[PDB]
Every structure is written in C-alpha cells, then in structure tokens.
Design goal:
The complex is a heterotetramer, with 2 copies of chain A (361 residues) and 2 copies of chain C.
Chain A: E1 17-22, E2 32-37, E3 43-48, E4 51-57, E5 63-71, E6 79-87, E7 93-99, E8 113-115, E9 121-127, E10 131-137, E11 142-147, E12 153-158, E13 165-170, E14 175-180, E15 186-191, E16 208-209, E17 213-217, E18 222-227, E19 234-240, H1 244-248, E20 252-253, E21 259-262, E22 267-273, E23 287-292, E24 297-303, E25 309-313, E26 318-322, E27 327-331, E28 338-343, E29 350-355
Antiparallel strand pairs in A: 1-2, 1-29, 2-3, 4-5, 5-6, 6-7, 8-9, 9-10, 10-11, 12-13, 13-14, 14-15, 16-17, 17-18, 18-19, 20-22, 21-22, 22-23, 23-24, 25-26, 26-27, 27-28
Chain C: H1 2-5, E1 17-19, E2 36-48, E3 53-63, E4 72-74, E5 102-105, E6 108-112
Antiparallel strand pairs in C: 1-4, 2-3, 3-5, 3-6
The chains are: A mainly beta (361), C mainly beta (115).
Bound molecules: (1S)-1-amino-2-(1H-indol-3-yl)ethanol (2 copies) and zinc ion (ZN) (2 copies).
One (1S)-1-amino-2-(1H-indol-3-yl)ethanol sits between chains D (14-15, 58, 86-87, 89-91, 99, 102) and A (52, 105-107).
Chain lengths: 361, 361, 115, 109
Amino acid sequence: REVLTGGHSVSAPQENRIYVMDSVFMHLTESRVHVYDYTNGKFLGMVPTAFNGHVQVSNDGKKIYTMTTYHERITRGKRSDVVEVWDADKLTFEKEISLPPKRVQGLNYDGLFRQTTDGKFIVLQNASPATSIGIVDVAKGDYVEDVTAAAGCWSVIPQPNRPRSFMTICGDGGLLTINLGEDGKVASQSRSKQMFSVKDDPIFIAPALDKDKAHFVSYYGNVYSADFSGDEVKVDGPWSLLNDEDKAKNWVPGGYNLVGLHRASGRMYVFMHPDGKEGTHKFPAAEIWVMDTKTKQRVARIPGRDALSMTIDQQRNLMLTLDGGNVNVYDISQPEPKLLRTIEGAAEASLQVQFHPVGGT
Amino acid sequence: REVLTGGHSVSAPQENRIYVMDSVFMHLTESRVHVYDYTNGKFLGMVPTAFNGHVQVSNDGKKIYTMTTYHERITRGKRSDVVEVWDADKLTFEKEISLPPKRVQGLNYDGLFRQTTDGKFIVLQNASPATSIGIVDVAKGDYVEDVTAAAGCWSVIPQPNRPRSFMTICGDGGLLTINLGEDGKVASQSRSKQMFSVKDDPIFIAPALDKDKAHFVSYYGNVYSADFSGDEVKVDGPWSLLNDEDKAKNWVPGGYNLVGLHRASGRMYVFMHPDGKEGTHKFPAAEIWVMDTKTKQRVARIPGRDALSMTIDQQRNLMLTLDGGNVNVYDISQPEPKLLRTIEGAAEASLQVQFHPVGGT
Amino acid sequence: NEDEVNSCDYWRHCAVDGFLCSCCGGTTTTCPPGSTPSPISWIGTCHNPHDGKDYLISYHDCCGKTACGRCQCNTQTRERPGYEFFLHNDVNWCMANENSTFHCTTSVLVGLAKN
Amino acid sequence: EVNSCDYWRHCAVDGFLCSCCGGTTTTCPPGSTPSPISWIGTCHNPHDGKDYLISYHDCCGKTACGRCQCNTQTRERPGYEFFLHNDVNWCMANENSTFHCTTSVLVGL
Ligand SMILES: N[C@@H](O)Cc1c[nH]c2ccccc12
Ligand SMILES: N[C@@H](O)Cc1c[nH]c2ccccc12
Ligand SMILES: [Zn+2]
Ligand SMILES: [Zn+2]
C-alpha cells in the first residue's frame, strides 16, 4: 500500500531556515549541522560533518558548504581535509574539494570559514600550527591559494563593499587586508595602522560587521573600529561600552560569536556579564546590551538567557541567540529586542547559528 | 618541573578490570569500550570502535578484540568491516583483519562476537541479511571460514568444554553445533532435536552457560537446557521460573544479556519484572531472581535497579549488572547477592559489560 | 496528526527501535532529505484501533546520515529474536545499504495481516 | 582534588582532564599520544603563593574521553596570540589529531 521514498526536499521555504552547527564535542567525530525552521521550531534535516565540522551557506542560497576532516580509520590512517558542497534543498552531497591537511580544527567562530562577497571564493583559516588563509575556487572546485602574508594573523572578515576582499586580525594589533584577483590569487594587500593594544586591550575576533566598516569589542568593554570605505583601512578606538555604574559592577563582554550589527539602525548587540576579571571572557551572557554606534550610548539591556553566540538577519530584523543547546529568536526591529520563541534542544554543543540567506545581497 | 609522557600501561592489574561497551547510540559512529576498575570505580582507559563496535577480551587475557565498520567518508564511500586486535595493557592498536562487508550491525549481545574456547579463532555473527557465522584465525590475521550452514540461525554459544566448538540457535527451535578443524574450517556439525516452540515459547538468546550445558529462559518465564557433555546435544524443558504467586502477578523475564550462571553452585541469575505481556521482553529488571537449577526453585530475589544486562565472574563470585549507564557490582558467593558498589556514568548507552578473563586459557 | 504520529504509542509504531523519521525532517513514509531508504526491513503486525484490523508494517530505515537523535522509540510488540530474523529489531536494517549508517526508522503499511 | 576544574593548575583547560581519563596530570591515558605543542597558561598555586607557567598538552589519537570537561580561561587569548589560545585543537601536530584529553604540565615559575 505504501512505499518509503527518498529524494525529497526540505519541507519549509528557504526563508524560514536556520543552521545550528552542532560540534557534539563529547563525540566530536560526529559533528553535524541541524537545519531548523525558526518560525515554528521544526527540525527540517541535517548534514553530517565528521570531526569538528564547520559550515556556511552560499551567498546565493543554493548550496551548503562544509569543511571537515576524515581519516581512513578515524583515529588512524591517512588524513583528508575537505570542503564539501551540499545541495541546500535536497541536503545531499555534491562535491568534495581537497584541502592541504592543515585546516583549522577549533570551535566554530564565524571567521574561520567564510566566503567572498561575490560568492566565488571560500576563504578559510589554516592552523597546523602553521597559519595562513586558504582560498577555494567554488566554480573550479579547487584549492587555489594559500596566503602566506596572513601568518601570525587570525580569522577572516569579508568586506561587504568589495567582491573579493577580506581582512584578518594580526598579532601586532593591526589588520591585514587581502584583495584577490579573479583567479583567487592575492592581487594586492595592505596593513592598517595598529588598532588595539594586544597586551592591554585584546579584542574578541567576532566582528560587528557593517557594509563598509567593522566594530570589535574588547575584553575590558571597549570598542574599536575599522573603516574600509576608502582605499585603505582606517582604524579608531577605543570608546567604552560602559557608563560609571556599569564600571562599578565590573561589567564586561563575554561569549564566542558574541556581537552583531543591525546595519539599518547602527545598533550593536553584545553579550555582557558583571564581575568581570581575568578568565571571564567566555562567560554566558547575563544580559544583551544594545548600543547605538553613532551616539556611543546603550539604548537597551535585556536578560541574556545564558547566551554565548548570536547572529543577525538584516532583512527580517531578527537576532538569534544560542546558549549551547537552545536557540532564542528575537525581533530587533525596535531598540528593545523582543523574544519571540525558544527552540529547545536544537543542539548538544553548538556555538554557532546562521540564517539561510534571502535574496542575493 | 614536568614532562608529559605516553606509552603507559593500564594502571590497575588485569584482575580488577571490566569492559563497558558503550554503543553511544545517539552518536553511533563514535562507539567505544570503557575500561573500569570494578574494585573502586576508577576509569582506566578506552578503545575507540567507530560505528556500532563489538568487543571481547582474548581468553588468555592478553588482547582486546573489536569488530566495527568504517567507510572512506563515514556516510559515503567504500565499506570496510574489520576485526581489530588491541594490546590489553597498552590499549593500542596492533592489527586489522579484513571481513566481508556483512558483519552484524546490532545491539551488543555477547553471542554476536565470541571466540573458540582455545582462543585461536574469533567467531562472529554475519547478516547480509542472510545469516552466517564468520571465523577469523587471530594469529594468521585472516578471515578463514564462513559458516553458511548457520543460515536461519542466530548467535554464537561457545562450548566451554571443547577447544573449537560452538552452537547457534535456529529458526526450527533447535540448536546447531559446529566443530572446526585445525585451520578453522568446518569439520562436523549436528542439529539437536527441537528444544523450544518458536511460536509458542520463544527463548531469549542469552545463555546461562555452564561448562557442559546451557540454560535459556523464555518470554513466558520457562527454562530450557541444552546439554553438550557429549558430542550429541540433548535438549530439555520447559520448567517454570514461576510459582503460583508469581504467575498471578504475570512475572516474566526481561532484558538483553539478561541471565548468568554461577557454575560452582548451579545458581542461575535472571532479570524479571511484573505485569508481563506481549512487548515487555526488553523491560528493565524490577528484580533479580536467583534460581537453583538442580532443585528448580528460587533461592533469592532482590531489587533489580532497572538493570538490563549482566555478567558473572566465576572465581571471584561476582555479578555485574548494567542499566544502560551505571554498573552495579554484587558479591554472589552466597545465595542472596550483596550489592558492593555502583559505578555511575560508566556509559551513555551500554547493554554489555564483561570481566577481564583471569583463569588463563 | 503530526503530534500523534510522532509518539511511540502511535498504532503503527508497535515494533520501532530507533528514531522516528517523522521527527527527523521526513514523514512516516518518506526519508528526511539526503537519507536513503533501506531495501530490507523487519516486519510486524500492528492492530489498528480505528478499524479493528491488524496490518503488516514494514520498518524500513533511512540510511547514509548519522543518528537523527529525535523521538527515540524502543517498542517491541510481537518482536522476536534474531533466529526469527525478519521479526527482529535489535539489528540495523540499513545493513545492506550502500551506506549502512543508521539515520532514522519508518513504519510503512504493507497491507492487511493474515488473521 | 586534581580531578576538579577548580584545581589550581587547570586554570586554562578547554577539554577533558586526562587525570579523569585513565592518565594523570602529566601522563597520557594508555594508547593516546602526547602532543608536542600546547597552549600555555599562568596559574596561581595556593600552596606557595606563586604563579606557574602551565603547558596544556593534549593526548591524542583516541576519541573524546568525555569525563571532567573543563572550560577555564585564565590568561587565555584569541587566535592572533596563537599559543595562548585554547579554542583550537592542540592535537593539530600529532600523527592523528583526534582529541582525547588535556593535561596540565608544570613548566616552572
Ligand atoms: N584542548 C583542546 O585541544 C581541546 C579542544 C578545544 N577546542 C577544540 C576544538 C576542536 C578540537 C579540539 C578542541
Ligand atoms: N531500526 C534499526 O535500524 C535501528 C537500530 C536498532 N538497533 C540498532 C543497532 C545498530 C544500528 C541500528 C539499530
Ligand atoms: Zn488485532
Ligand atoms: Zn598569583
């Protein structure tokens, strides 16, 4: 009477989908991406990502890209580091792209696995412990460049105002900009002036990223900025997130993917906790603070629900927060975020959630 | 000042060691064996076993054998079913033995992965889904025989009184006995008369195994026996585990590796629960019943602690029980078992625990 | 009723050992996206309360993705050990697939049982 | 305890304590390989009131121990201060980089 069939597409429209990267740290060889509908909390499917996978969605919304490591016998045998291309609607494997055996194995910060604005290149962090940035040509399905200039730097911040340019944060407190040619090789590069004191005021790597500038928060609650609207990157800061009452109770940021920018309003979202001191920089949010980046003033503060990571959808004015297992959905169209729902048990050990792209820009 | 060293042996003597096979069903590609000291609950080490591993210790106590499945890309690519030989004291990999791609994938009943009494051959269950019993010559490192004569049968019960003989339970309600030759190939075989009615009184596969006979319990609380003191297996039963008071409360057995025999006393240990009906045959133990197999009467009943599987050590007069995550250690030197300790959090999803062998082969 | 079919107590799930596909991005009769149906399965009969008839149910798995982890069931009505192999549910019915990794399990209606 | 995340020398551990995994603070559990590199922390020893440099070597080539998970962050810094960073796999230079557990090895004052 009935027959079990495969070949099916994800049941909910792309515009409803979010991606929860479950590291499954307790069983890290079985990491995976869980696909959820953020409107109703429904589980839609998943993509297996082996040991410590990383994930992003193609800017055009058609494909899921993963990065992972295999070994012939898991804990022994030959290593294969790969990027995989998966169909977004069928959640099927399409293509493996071979990487040199040095892709970063680490927690899922957004900046370790990114793409150029034009979507033609995947840009990823290598650490073996030799550091460089690797470039994958999506069209060709090939690893095409290894950016030596990035040794001693960390993470990738794409420039949304240019098709194939990105920045990385260097160990001297400045930023390195890389501009790729149409073949994905380095065409030019530039180093900014020093933005922050590495010893005295280290920044979290997560950018609050605007179209032509990026903001960063520091371990002590200062804000730095990099403006890339012109030919060269202009840096500034610090300004403090903290008023006098804030400072008196030692409020500071903490988290992983801990900031976000709502580009239309210029509001920056930051996870914060009181009683800050050495060693608290990854503490769960006691609060989410909402900062106006033009006025440099806090415009809202709400309970943090122990969140550690966030992401923002510009188009729908939404912020997702994630405490490691549960995803909170907030309407951020107004200065005070409004909690819409919580998706419980979205992951066992996730520090990264992302929206499916809507439109193509 | 200090240096990190490796290459160390397990810190407790072999006589203290037990093996908790953790299927990690929620992340079944990362199954593993956890090694514990039963005297103090100390975690001693582990052996990774990939997808749905099976495990046993060599009869001479020198090696750990595992059985597992790999694929080149875990969820795609070529399959490799293997036995691995691991050193028991160093917990290091020694060698892989290739199997045909049909080793049983299933829950960890003892009888799916066994060895001949002499320890020369590993004897394992296959399902393609046609069933057969595979024979591996450990020293040669080769799969040497496929006992397709066991089609329509299931599980391996070694005869502890002969070097290279084992039995399996067949769909005709009888047992099939296989005797291997010097190279591991089948030499002779025989089918018993019918022991149990498959339709009317199905038995659990787990034997309560003596040196020359095996007892089995049924879904309805009856006991059957297969006597292999001679070359022809002689079968008998049923006798009931249940008195009239027991019957009135519908007591029945339930569990996985749910029985055991203390050979010196003839006491059989069985997990039981009240209110038995169709579908309750894998329920956790409300009680452990202790039966004298000679007098056919119950001699003790104790709280079951929700146990599902057990194992017996003959020389130290111990019984271990396991509820899926915790292991209970009992002294069974007297008819009434005495609870000595519970090892909490020994596994996430284990249905099998085993002692390190101590007799010698 | 989505809520109803997602329960281990739903009538046709009477011998399910595994994660219900209907909770994993699929349905009772379709694999979640990117997982492959098993060509073989265990079988059992389940009583349908709505018409009082017993039906043969084929418990096919979906394969080639890692464990869904949602809506785990371990129901055992009429289930038998491996010497009645096609009635046995403590084995991976993905065992003969191109990729045997177990993702979730389904309950597919075959037709009326023999009385 | 030394099996507690609050033990003084475990002040920048992101991982499972090897002393809970069949090893000790300075020895890998049987069959896991010591990492040659590590992140480094500075931890206060209450016994003598002095700070010690601690090298957080991993043990590698076996899957996750799962016991005594810690996420302490004293003096930990991001990846642009590479060897002070503990959100990367310090098994990365091992023959097999599967992460098993983390040790807390005293380098000196
Ligand atoms: N001490 C580290 O090696 C454990 C670890 C932390 N984050 C990771 C990410 C991937 C792999 C291992 C780790
Ligand atoms: N319905 C089965 O495929 C789910 C399952 C039950 N026990 C297993 C053991 C190993 C693999 C899968 C399973
Ligand atoms: Zn009926
Ligand atoms: Zn100090």
